[model samples]
Target: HMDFKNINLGIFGHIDHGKTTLSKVLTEIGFSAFKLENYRITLVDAPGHADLIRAVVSAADIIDLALIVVDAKEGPKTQTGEHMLILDHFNIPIIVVITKSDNAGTEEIKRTEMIMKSILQSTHNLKNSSIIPISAKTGFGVDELKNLIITTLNNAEIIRNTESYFKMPLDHAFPIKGAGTVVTGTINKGIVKVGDELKVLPINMSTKVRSIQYFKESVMEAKAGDRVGMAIQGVDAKQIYRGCILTSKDTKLQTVDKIVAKIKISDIFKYNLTPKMKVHLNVGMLIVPAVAVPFKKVTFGKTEENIILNEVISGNECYCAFELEEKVLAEVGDRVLITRLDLPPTTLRICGHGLIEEFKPIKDLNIKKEVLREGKVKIDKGRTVIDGLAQSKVAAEKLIGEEISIEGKDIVGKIKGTFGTKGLLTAEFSGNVENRDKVILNRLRRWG
Candidate 1:
């Protein structure tokens, strides 16, 4: 019987920044050492490069505590900012580990500490976490970091729901020569035991858990918050693919091609997010091509509205519908990261991350939508003015092209070009209008 409480810890930072070295030095035995103070702590491997941020998003949910290793020599770089922001999306508690302290002969430690404050202070969470300066070679602050980790956990009050059915998304799946196919990942929810029947999703293969290993030791059972290597029976390694999930039958988790969510695009993204824009959707361990359609959510009394958008305002919360190019074993409550994989290396490609709210099928997909582009009609002298439709000639030119409807009437009208220096346009219709009336204008959108 295993009585030790398990905690999943992750080491995160840019490549060549001494993340692995810090991990080795912190744990005397190995990268993910265990058996300390009745807790089994395992180090989760995260994406170190900018290109593999999808991997970072996938690993965010599994980590209970994250050690953000920063280089004392180079300080925080481009990937560092992006990674910290991704962790902010999940609200994972952070403990900053500044490595290369032994080499910083003349480098003042306070300067580096000050820079850390500037970056962390702007984030939504984890700004007040501890920052420990250490030298991997000399073991200067190595033990101090250990004490801080335990302290962070002591006050964290992390809540894991073991009452739910066992579910673990596969991070790595491979065939062993003689033993069998072994799939490994951190159990995000529920519990697992040896000899228990389970289902490997997408493949839908019914199999039994031959054995379970929690890091270095073989265990009789492992539950939520534990990293497990489960030997599964009766399924070839080829049948299982990336993002494949192992779950209990009654959990009701399944593969989906389309999902809906209320997204808040990152303000760090300079470009606008338009409807039907192609983006890489990262959920769980799955990253696939998906089209994101941003829509505004308006609540009128007891009713709600969904209208398509031309471009999404930065940092604003809105509803977005995404259709994946391929099916992914994901569901609501999973953290979703959106990125522009096609962008250049110099730019920040991670545009946003959000909570997956709902799942819908691709067939008979009817998303209710409406347009909000309407202006009040004005009458100056004897002429009906439509100046409020747009103050500039550019937006006015586009709106005047659409066949407009006056308020709620069937009296369709047309617009006459720029009437004044202020960019107001005149209107022409067969209906009568004395004063202010609503001019409605535009979508039969072809959403991919």
Candidate 2:
């Protein structure tokens, strides 16, 4: 018997595209003996609803292959394009299933196939992918599609890292009766055994594995890619949440507020994001508000060399930095989805996907930095203005055009301009200031 345990196929597509129903059908037929032609198979059923789209991306992190479901009558839709980009981002192979064939006429189905072909070719640069027509409502083409899936999986080879530390992104977490806290997800790496002490990320709390269950069967241990439920000891239900990663105690998992990544804006996105724009970041299952900033260093396109802007337009790719509003557990190379929360529902919500390249923690601004008072200006209204050593010209410019704090006291300011070849900074304070008064600078900028 060929083992299909190493293979995980994600069922993805738009809402009402027969993804859920297709999963049920595959479950009944394949899990009948947990084998198709003597090969074991596991189906990762991803959600199709807009709000639940993260579920699909989370599933993509664990699956080895994709079975993209398309409504024969409706053809390619918004979410279809989103799911395709996700698959391409992960480099997962796809098998297109044109569903609802019973309801769609042959001409309509053909048109959908042609439309999808053109889209995949133009947008995703995918070509000549296998397309099968199936109807879950009727038995028509169901068995044939099932056989095709088995054949595709049987031929495709997937390699997983079993030597790495055990890590699983928690997708479902709840308190089971008699069990302290149970978390279920696919094991992305390494082996997890019963009684092994592990740490939950972001919180970095210690917990022991009380038990492990795979596919409703009790197992002493589970390895990479196994969709397993782990009964965790010691952690309360309230302490655990979705998007938390479970790993070994010695694992070096750091939480950072700033991340640099290679971003690919969706072709369907309508608007542009400038530097310091506010957006939401979807990583794994966590959605947090963040400020998008393009790194001034790297150049990905052929534009002016001196014009430094962290901006991104539709259907383009660039390297940018994201300052998260709150710290979250993240690692280099983690995939992140960007969404604009302020836009209306008529516009597409997902803006882009990025792969993390760097993580830089923003330092605490409360630390005092000495500002040398070079000179002073009298504004006559009981306000003294001055320009001094504000560090660099950029720092002076930053202090300029914004309200700042003097000796921890909040005050408004204006830039008098740079002085000498040394780039001597100049800015005015709203309150009284001695020539060498110690000052604390508070930036008006929102990094997040």
Candidate 3:
């Protein structure tokens, strides 16, 4: 028999905020003796503390939906805001579960809701998102939350094709008395069968699936979108470390000591992130200190160049190309988290989620000419942007000199240079200008 579309759902929140407990309770049975549906849902329970923020971002990237857990009594936290940014980076929809409803008295409810709005307001994509309150211990609003998940799935684009390789991000690892090393996490993609050989990446460990469990029941095979328990045949707990991924042999799960990422600047960061500055990188259970070098100019028609920086503008946002000085296990599309060593573990904004295009540093390389010469050849806004960047009118008047071309307002791009907002640069392509001065242009665009 074939499995239905596998929907990867992520459990996110702060440490001691009930992310793991709620996941365990919701997977097999209710937390407090309430009987809920035993539907086949694969889940990823990520760490929510500052030390584990990278893991949270990595897990959020592969999941289809997120239950952004928060404490109703405490309301939204710094960690909560950070997790929200991660979800926004991956374009993942979040269902807000306000924990401790039974414990948070009526007076605290309104205060908590206001806190939720304020936290959401600080981020670009999450303002006015949906929220539901429930106590995992009391079963209050639990069913309502499940209903919301189903409703969300109704609009989801389900992939029923079972042709891709199966992979699981190992979030937990322990030894069974008889079974050796067992690991658990959401399946990143594909399926696995009993006795099939898989590789544990980064650690270079190998193991066979002696047995598998789906929601505490024995299963012959496991596929994408299923919460899985794997009994690895030939490895010890130490060899198969946590954060190691179990994937098909042919798939190229990667590790990189360096990367070219677009760092999103946050207005609230306590310290500035300067190019070539060293800091920690977190993804899944992996943490490493890395040096960042920013790319200064990725002009519309110009090339990207790596340049040094004095400091990332605090309280201001911009997209800068960056590179790590050392090696780490990062891959294209992997969600990453970075922070300064001097900054306190207060609330952090999800700086940016980026698509990794290349590994070797392109900072000094002329990316503009290379794109025009060898890469996909398409003009950005053939006339207008050329005129703006060139500061000419007669030769490119269709781009700048006419009332038909220039509107009362100019198109506003995000100053931080993020790729999350859709159609941010589209209006200009169609010859419809929203009148803008240099300040408006400075306020709207980002590349992260």
Q: Can you tell me which runs of candidate 2 are displaced by over 4 Å?
A: 1-4, 30-34, 50-52, 155-157, 177-179, 268-273, 296-307, 310-317, 341-346, 361-448
The candidate that wins on TM-score is 1
Comparing candidate 1 with candidate 3, which one achieves the higher TM-score? 1
Segments of candidate 3 deviating more than 4 angstroms: 1-9, 14-39, 46-48, 51-54, 102-107, 135-143, 156-165, 176-180, 266-273, 297-326, 349-351, 361-448
Tell me model 3's lDDT, rounded to 2 decimals.
Answer: 0.58
In terms of lDDT, model 2 sits at: 0.68
Give the lDDT ranking, best first: 1, 2, 3
Model 3 per-residue lDDT tens digits across residues 279-333: 6666556666666655444344564443333243532333334455544555565
By TM-score rank, best first, the candidates go 1, 2, 3
Q: How high is the lDDT of residue 68 in model 1?
A: 79
- Across 1-448, the per-residue lDDT of candidate 1 in tens digits comes to 7576667787777787788788777577422565556677877765456433655576565567888777887888776767787778778898888888887754556667678888888888777878888988898988788888888877776777688888888877888744368888778778888998889887787888998987777989887877778889877787777668889887768688888877866654564655677898887776788987777665657766555653546437666788899887776787788877677655566778888888864233444455556677778776777757677777676655566677766687777666665557776777676477877765334334
Whole-model lDDT values for every prediction: 0.74, 0.68, 0.58
Best by lDDT: 1
Which stretches of model 1 miss by more than 4 angstroms? 1-3, 29-31, 50-56, 105-108, 176-179, 268-271, 300-303, 310-316, 361-448
- Residue 363 of model 2 has an lDDT of 35
Instruction: Rate residue 285 of model 3 by lDDT.
Output: 60
Q: On residues 1-448, what C-alpha lDDT tens digit does candidate 2 reach at each position?
A: 3544646767778878988888888778511124577555677654445444566555555666678889999897766766776676666778889999999999999999888887777545345567888899897788888788777776666666688777788876788654489888778778888989999988788889998988778989899878787889777777777668898866645777787777776654464655667888876667789977553333337632312243424325565667898777777777878876566544456777888877863332211112224333323365444445455666565455543445534455655565444445556656455555544443212343
